[PDB]
């Protein structure tokens, strides 16, 4: 049952079993039904934790591979490459599971702008994680797919979301990170990050305690990156 998968997913979060959580959420999504704000967040948390641990692992194994190549460690060596490629394939597979769930169940069956932006921010994100580990032919095609979803989401969020909305702020942050780190455009990143920070700043005076605290958290990350990029 669907409720039983959502329940075991909330339990898996508490026990910090995010791959279990991921499996329970994918199964809940696969039921065909729409997600509430809560379910979307469980789907996000599950996979962002799964893929975050695979990204951090890949970063370590690439760092070791660079050093073993720099030193000409003939025997230390093929094993880093075999293992880094193994961790990369697991990452590619997790991103392909998320992107599959997105393109085939979630983006299509999106009830409003708010969820559609949420799902399009996910698509852009998972294509960005894919592009961090990609090499040639595939790399450029993946960079185009992240920009597409991030753009389609920017358009919907500018037209049907307040500038203080945490999904809008989070989307703009990730897109400016894509520009700086992936797309090679620091100016488009600084332009996007400054604009987003300013628009939300202008409308902070109209938020309740819960609203203000959620928006100023992401706004702080926008300005932090600005400090780093300037």
């Amino acid at each position: 049952e669907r409720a039983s998968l959502i329940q075991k997913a909330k339990l898996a979060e508490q026990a910090e079993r995010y791959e279990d959580m991921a499996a329970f959420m994918k199964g809940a999504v696969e039921k065909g039904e729409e997600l509430s704000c809560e379910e979307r967040n469980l789907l996000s948390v599950a996979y962002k934790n799964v893929v975050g641990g695979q990204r951090a692992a890949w970063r370590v194994l690439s760092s070791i591979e660079q050093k073993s190549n720099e030193e000409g460690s003939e025997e230390k060596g093929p094993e880093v490459r075999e293992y880094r490629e193994k961790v990369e394939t697991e990452l590619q597979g997790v991103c392909d599971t998320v992107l599959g769930l997105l393109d085939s169940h979630l983006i299509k069956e999106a009830g409003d702008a708010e969820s559609r932006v949420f799902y399009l921010k996910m698509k852009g994100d998972y294509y960005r994680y894919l592009a961090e580990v990609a090499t040639g032919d595939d790399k450029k095609r993946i960079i185009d797919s992240a920009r597409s979803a991030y753009q389609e989401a920017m358009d919907i969020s500018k037209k049907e979301m307040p500038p203080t909305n945490p999904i809008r702020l989070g989307l703009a942050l990730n897109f400016s990170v894509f520009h700086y780190e992936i797309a090679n455009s620091p100016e488009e990143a600084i332009s996007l990050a400054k604009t987003t920070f300013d628009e939300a700043m202008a409308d902070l005076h109209t938020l309740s305690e819960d609203s203000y605290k959620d928006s100023t958290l992401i706004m702080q990350l926008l300005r932090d990156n600005l400090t780093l990029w300037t």
Partner: peptide, 8 residues
């Protein structure tokens, strides 16, 4: 190190 959107 840069920051990306946090967990919801």
């Amino acid at each position: 190190r840069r920051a990306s959107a946090p967990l919801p």
